[PDB]
Design goal:
The structure is cut from a larger assembly and holds two copies of chain A, one copy of chain B and one copy of chain C. Chain A is mainly alpha-helical. In chain A, about 35% of the residues lie in helices and about 0% in strands. Chain A is built from one helix and no strands. The N and C termini of chain A lie far apart (about 20 Å). By secondary structure, chain B is mostly helical. In chain B, helix 12 runs antiparallel to helix 13. Helices cover about 60% and strands about 0% of the residues of chain B. In chain C, the strands form two sheets. Chain C has a five-stranded mixed barrel with strand order 1-2-3-5-4. A five-stranded parallel β-sheet of chain C has the order 7-8-9-6-10. In chain C, helix 7 packs parallel to helix 8 and helix 11 packs across helix 12. The longest helix of chain C has 25 residues. Chain C is globular. In chain C, about 30% of the residues are buried. Classes of the chains: A mainly alpha, B mainly alpha, C alpha/beta. At the B-C interface, helix 37 and helix 39 of B face helix 1 and helix 5 of C. The structure holds adenosine-5'-triphosphate and magnesium ion. The site of adenosine-5'-triphosphate (ATP) has 16 residues of chain C, from helix 6, helix 9 and helix 11. Chain C: It is found in: Cytoplasm; Nucleus. Chain C: Keywords: ATP-binding, Cytoplasm, Isopeptide bond, Lipoprotein, Myristate, Nucleotide-binding, Nucleus, Proteasome, Ubl conjugation.
């Protein structure tokens, strides 16, 4: 799991 | 699952879900006993690893949380990570998940804070060993997956990413943070970043983009290049490597201000020069806006190949694409030195080969003559321009031109523009010069002036290579002390060369617009042309244009319209880069008049572009301030104030305009909405500001290349029948022209209604008539864009004289300017080694589906159509090359670019 | 991954829209100009207080009409003559004054729950190339349904009247239902969608009135695509025998001919019909010149089944275990809903593991279950 | 109405080739298409039987 997958959910 | 002690491997896995008997008790007990037992712990390190590997199957936080809770202490309590220095350091492998089991898989704020900090130091010191790297690696490629490590690994990458980000926000840098406690410096953590990047590129794409951005330098990317140019074939194929690289640069346009943005693009250019596809290389060379980069790729195909091969023909093609003709100049002359075949090669780089191909297209389309035939009074004036507007592009109407009756019955400035429209029948052609000469040797000086307008317009399709260059004819007419003659001359020069810098051209345009003590209102054109030459490429910021604007403003205020054009000419000059425009903004602001404040805000738009989100709000504060000063009161100057008001409205739209193209294709939808409410905010405020806002809106759509092209001009047209200024209709049809007779049928009907139904003045009628014939040319002869057609986020040069003309209320003099319609996009075609005039097949799509690109890439399914199509505008711009089964394979990639295709058979 | 920046770009513009709009309202909206202020003085003179909705029965051409109110008294109303005298027609809802009734104004739109059924409330986010494959049978719905609306340009060139209608049919699970929703997403033309099983009611005569409504909305909205989902559900479906039954089925069919083209000469409606029983349809509907080219769907072949399975596995997590290429091989001329069900069930087998890797083993177990709906819902099993 | 759809389906074969005109040939293919569909269905000359 990439470090961005966590942050696409918030945007 | 339950406790059924230590026998087979199965029951050990179930034992350690509750409590290890082989990790937590043992390592702690052992460590606080002997330190000769460090050899024995080392053997159990591998044992500990396996139990984690087995328990990634399980998806519950609890069976790691409680189990390893006392092992998390042992790290600093007994091990201390320095009791026998190498031996505990190398044993921090199982201990790194243990800390994280309390960080990520348990949510308690006191500990979410405390252990972030412990985790950051031990990542940095154990990535020196590079054994932290291998721990990471076996978890990314896992044996089994679950929720926990999928959130925990993001924590590992963020400790590193975090420190680097904090050094830009704060000057505290390295281990003086209290949220990491660990530096990024040295080759302690720097060596950790490089190693991580290598592994994470290979299997995913993780920390690779964050490293580039947060370092913010050309250096970070130059480290990326090393790895990726290696990986270009065996790891992953060429094509995929391109998709990583271009994804980075397009994506970070709102994220890098001018000097950081160009610095990243240096490296993209460089990777492409290294890799197979030198077509990708050339395109980034334009993007930077360097002459220098264009040459090297041009030498790169041409020089090492000894024979003419497809390779020289390809070289000339790559340079031709820019209709700005920045590339066109550079690419010629290298061919003369080499000496293969001069005659085909040089034409191919310049815009002469594009003359030849339009003829084949034209034969299919035909020519339609349905233009007005009204005689005498003002009705003659309206009609004589309209015939030219129906036949824009290269067309045939010889017999009508020879019909000099209606030409001669125009009077005033009408004579100048009447002959000018005749020239736009042969827009982008060599031939037609003979018809122009006729008028040039007879009757009043006024028609002679109009002949020059036609020469300039025709010269867009033939100038580069210094083959029949426009300068040659038009220089005698510049010198001529007569204002009518001179103004027409330099307007034709400015169009013809667009961004092409050439020395003879540059220096003709300097002594003019440097004597603006003289009151000449048609000496706006003096600066217009000079501004253009800069556009497309890195700005000189010529001290001549800046100088003559300041002198002019001091000298006269009676000609406010003239100084208003000039205020825009400066902002239009500075296009071609946004780095240099930062210095000249302050130079313009140094001088201070209320009149000088007007000039400042137009140029602030050009400077702050491609991160301009501050700029938009800034031009809204600007709007408040007139009323702000006035409120206090409520509780020579006339010209200066009126300039102040109009520049501000023009600037608001202009800022948005630059921004929406450069910053991806996605923002274009939203900025359409901003303009509509913008007209609304001025409307039923101040009356004067409303009039200016109507005209800007139409060219705002035309500049940005808005997606929907059916709906908007037509909705706007009905609303604007009631409101003043029919000149708005002129600006709506610049957007509507699109693929002709898709939208454009409704334009003729609609605009025909507002005009035919109600008349109030013959002046208002004249504007409404002209707009209606401009939109179409028969059966999508051409399309219009401002996009370069090499970059789709690009902006043109030749269309900026259209962008000027919405600023001011209507004049017969404005009619002279508007005939120009250049910036044409070529009909896509496959040119062989002799040059074939027809394509084969192509794919068309309306729009992209890609959410991992946003500049637009055609998908690979499409709907297929035949040859001899002009490249459809917005609503059809995706083009894919079709021909692969027949062994026709493109050399020249096309992505809804203008580009001329070239193919190699096998 | 790494589309974050595209998400933030999009987001930033949303923030800028919110801002400009709020600030504009607040003392720069339309509060301080006389072409609003003095016009509304005399707008409110002849307006209420109550604005008493009427129903427009008939117009009289002298600036009057006979309205019947919802409150039951008639009025022979005047018409002020600034609202445009003849721009209002029977079935419009009218604003009558609190005193002596004049048509103060006219409301365009009055939301009925009966056009809610047709109208969309959701966006069909799967569009072109999520139904990927059947790229030869999508040139008979995007060269005659989508494309004339997008480009009337190509059809000005040939002249004559543009394509009219299509009928889709073939075996279940060829994407028939979604194709229609995917061309109407992209054009953004007025998407009415009506199910085949709501035309049949257990009430009579109001069935054809419902169907009559659907096309009046289409003709009222110039770019129009009407998806009639399921019109095999008109000859296999019936309720009671006194208000469903044969008589109802005949009536509805005939209503639909008048609507679709008949004598009406209405606005350009594209009709898209899903069916797989093509003798529930009139011999006045499956002649062409109303429905022009006819579309047959067959089960997608093996290389088309690679495309179908590739939509589904971009969403699936992948492993070094996974072998896609053998999942296609077992399937022989099978439907694209089997492939869609295998991957959804393969993710159900992953979930049971409580793991987030979907492997070849999860797909093949789900493949045998998906072929079990074809060998054991057949109780003969192997053909007797 | 069959013949009314010869022209439009001939206009679709014109558009794949990219024409502004139709010729004889594309009317041959168009006619062949409509005829096969008539067999595939019922009502080819039918009155809906009887007199
Ligand atoms: N080419 C395809 N690619 C992707 N998914 C497909 C494709 N064909 C069908 N499917 C899937 O199969 C399922 C059923 O197809 P759909 O509902 O679109 O219409 P149908 O052919 O009338 O079948 P039914 O109504 O019996 O389900 C849907 O979930 C759809 O996404
Ligand atoms: Mg369905």
């Amino acid at each position: 799991a990439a470090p961005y997958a966590a942050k696409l959910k918030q945007t | 699952m339950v406790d059924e002690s230590d026998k087979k491997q199965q029951t050990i896995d179930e034992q350690s879900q509750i409590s290890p008997e082989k990790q937590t008790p043992n390592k702690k007990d052992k460590k606080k006993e002997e330190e000769e037992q460090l050899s024995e712990e080392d053997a159990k390190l591998k044992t500990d690893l396996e139990l984690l590997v087995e328990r990634l199957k399980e998806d519950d936080s609890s069976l790691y949380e409680a189990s390893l809770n006392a092992l998390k202490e042992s790290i600093k309590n007994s091990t201390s990570s320095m009791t026998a220095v190498p031996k505990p350091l190398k044993f921090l492998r199982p201990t790194y998940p243990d800390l994280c089991s309390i960080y990520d898989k348990w949510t308690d704020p006191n500990l979410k804070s405390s252990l972030a900090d412990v985790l950051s130091i031990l990542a940095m010191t154990y990535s020196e060993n590079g054994k932290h790297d291998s721990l990471r690696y076996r978890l990314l490629s896992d044996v089994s997956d679950f929720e926990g490590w999928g959130h925990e690994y993001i924590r590992h990458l963020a400790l590193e990413i975090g420190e680097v980000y904090n050094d830009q926000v704060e000057k505290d840098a390295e281990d003086e943070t209290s949220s990491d406690g660990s530096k990024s410096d040295g080759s302690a953590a720097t060596s950790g970043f490089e190693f991580s990047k290598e592994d994470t590129l290979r299997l995913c794409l993780d920390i690779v983009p964050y490293f580039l951005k947060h370092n913010g330098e050309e250096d970070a990317v130059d480290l990326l290049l090393e790895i990726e140019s290696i990986d270009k074939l065996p790891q992953f194929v060429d094509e995929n490597t391109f998709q990583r690289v271009c994804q980075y640069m397009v994506a970070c346009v709102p994220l890098l201000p001018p000097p950081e943005d160009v610095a990243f693009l240096k490296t993209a250019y460089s990777i492409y020069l290294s890799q197979n596809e030198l077509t990708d290389a050339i395109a980034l060379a334009v993007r930077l806006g360097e002459e220098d980069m264009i040459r090297s790729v041009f030498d790169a195909t041409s020089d090492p190949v000894m024979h003419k091969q497809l390779a020289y023909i390809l070289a000339a093609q790559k340079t031709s694409f820019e209709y700005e003709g920045v590339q066109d100049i550079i690419g010629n002359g290298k061919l003369s030195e080499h000496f293969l075949y001069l005659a085909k090669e040089l034409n191919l780089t310049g815009p002469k080969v594009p003359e030849d191909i339009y003829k084949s297209h034209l034969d299919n389309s035909k020519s339609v003559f349905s233009s007005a035939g009204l005689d005498s009074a003002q009705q003659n004036l309206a009609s004589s321009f309209v015939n030219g507007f129906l036949n824009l592009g290269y067309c045939n109407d010889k017999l009508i031109v020879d019909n000099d009756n209606w030409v001669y019955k125009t009077k005033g400035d009408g004579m100048t523009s009447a002959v000018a429209s005749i020239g736009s029948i042969y827009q982008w052609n060599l031939d037609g010069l003979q018809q122009l000469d006729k008028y040039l040797y007879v009757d009043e000086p006024e028609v002679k002036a109009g002949a020059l307008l036609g020469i300039g317009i025709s010269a867009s399709g033939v100038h580069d290579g210094e083959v029949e260059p426009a300068l040659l004819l038009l220089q005698d007419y510049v010198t001529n002390p007569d204002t009518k003659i001179s103004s027409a001359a330099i307007l034709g020069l400015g169009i013809a060369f667009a961004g092409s810098k050439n020395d003879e051209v540059l220096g003709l345009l300097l002594p003019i617009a440097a004597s603006t003590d003289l009151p000449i209102e048609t000496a706006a054109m003096a600066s217009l042309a000079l501004a253009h030459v800069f556009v497309g490429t890195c700005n000189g910021d010529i001290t001549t244009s800046i100088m003559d604007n300041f002198l002019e403003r001091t000298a006269i205020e009676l000609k406010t319209d003239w100084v208003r054009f000039l205020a825009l000419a400066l902002g239009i000059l500075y296009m071609g880069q946004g780095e240099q425009v930062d210095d000249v903004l302050e130079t313009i602001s140094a001088i201070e008049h209320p009149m000088t404040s007007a000039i400042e805000v137009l140029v602030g738009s050009c400077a702050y572009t491609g991160t301009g989100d501050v700029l938009l709000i800034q031009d809204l504060l600007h709007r408040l301030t007139p009323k702000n000063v006035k409120g206090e009161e409520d509780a020579e100057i006339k010209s200066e104030e009126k300039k102040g008001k109009s520049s501000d409205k023009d600037a608001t739209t202009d800022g948005k305009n630059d921004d929406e193209e450069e910053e991806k294709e996605a923002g274009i939808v939203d900025e359409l909405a901003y303009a509509v409410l913008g007209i609304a905010l001025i409307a039923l405020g101040e009356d004067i500001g409303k009039e200016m806002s109507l005209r800007h809106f139409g060219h705002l759509m035309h500049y940005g290349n808005e997606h929907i092209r059916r709906m908007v001009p037509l909705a706007m047209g009905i609303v604007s029948v009631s409101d003043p200024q029919m000149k708005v209709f002129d600006t709506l049809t610049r957007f509507s022209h699109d693929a002709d007779l898709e939208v454009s049928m409704n334009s003729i009907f609609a605009m025909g209604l507002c005009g035919a139904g109600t008349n109030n003045a013959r002046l208002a009628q004249l504007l409404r008539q002209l707009a209606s014939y401009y939109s179409r040319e028969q059966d999508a002869l051409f399309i219009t864009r401002l996009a370069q057609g090499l970059l789709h986020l690009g902006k043109g040069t030749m269309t900026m004289d259209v962008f000027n003309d919405a600023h001011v209320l209507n004049k017969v003099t404005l009619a002279s300017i508007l005939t120009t319609a250049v910036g044409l996009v070529s009909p896509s075609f496959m040119l062989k080694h002799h040059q074939l005039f027809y394509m084969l097949n192509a794919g068309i799509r309306p729009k992209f589906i890609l959410a991992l690109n946003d500049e637009g890439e055609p998908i690979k399914v499409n709907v297929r159509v035949g040859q001899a199509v002009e490249t459809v505008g917005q609503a059809g711009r995706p083009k894919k090359i079709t021909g692969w089964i027949t062994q026709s394979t493109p050399v020249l990639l096309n992505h809804g670019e203008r580009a001329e295709l070239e193919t190699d058979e096998y | 991954r790494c589309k974050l920046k595209l998400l933030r770009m999009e987001r930033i513009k949303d923030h800028l829209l919110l801002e400009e709009e709020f600030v504009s309202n607040s003392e720069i909206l339309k509060p301080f100009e006389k072409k609003q202020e003095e016009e509304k003085k005399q707008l409110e003179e002849i307006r209420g207080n109550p604005l008493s909705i009427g129903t427009l029965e008939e117009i009289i051409d002298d600036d009057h009409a006979i309205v019947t109110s919802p409150t039951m008294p008639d009025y022979y109303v005047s018409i002020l003559s600034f609202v445009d005298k003849e721009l209002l027609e029977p079935g419009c809802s009218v604003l009558l004054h609190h005193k002596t009734m004049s048509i103060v104004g006219v409301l365009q739109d009055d939301a009925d729950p009966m056009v809610s059924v047709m109208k969309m409330d959701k966006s069909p986010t799967e569009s072109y190339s999520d139904i990927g494959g059947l790229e030869s049978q999508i040139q008979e719905i995007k060269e005659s349904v989508e494309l004339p609306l997008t480009h009337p340009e190509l059809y000005e060139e040939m002249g004559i009247k543009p394509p009219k209608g299509v009928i889709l049919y073939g075996a279940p699970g060829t994407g028939k239902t979604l194709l229609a929703k995917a061309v109407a997403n992209q054009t953004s033309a007025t998407f009415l969608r009506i199910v085949g099983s709501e035309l049949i009611q257990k009430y009579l005569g109001d069935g054809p009135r419902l169907c009559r409504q659907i096309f009046k909305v289409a003709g009222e909205n110039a770019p129009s695509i009407v998806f009639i989902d399921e019109i095999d559900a008109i000859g296999t479906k019936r309720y009671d025998s006194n208000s469903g039954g044969e008589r109802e089925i005949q009536r509805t069919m005939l209503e639909l001919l008048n609507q679709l083209d008949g004598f009406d000469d209405r606005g350009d409606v594209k009709v898209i019909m899903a069916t797989n029983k093509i003798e529930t349809l009139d011999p006045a509907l499956i002649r062409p010149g109303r429905i022009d080219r006819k579309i047959l769907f067959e089960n997608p072949d093996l290389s088309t089944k690679k495309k179908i399975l590739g939509i589904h596995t971009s969403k699936m997590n992948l492993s070094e275990d996974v072998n896609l290429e053998t999942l296609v091989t077992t399937k022989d001329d099978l439907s694209g809903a089997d492939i869609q069900a295998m991957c959804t069930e393969a993710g159900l087998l992953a979930l049971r593991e409580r793991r987030m890797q979907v492997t070849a083993e999860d797909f093949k177990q789900a493949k045998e279950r998906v072929m079990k709906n074809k060998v054991e819902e057949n109780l003969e099993g192997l053909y007797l | 109405a069959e013949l009314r759809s010869v022209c439009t389906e001939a206009g679709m074969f014109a558009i794949r080739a990219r024409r502004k005109v139709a010729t004889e040939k594309d009317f041959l293919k168009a006619v062949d298409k409509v005829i096969s569909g008539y067999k595939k269905f019922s009502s080819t000359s039918r009155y809906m039987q009887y007199n």
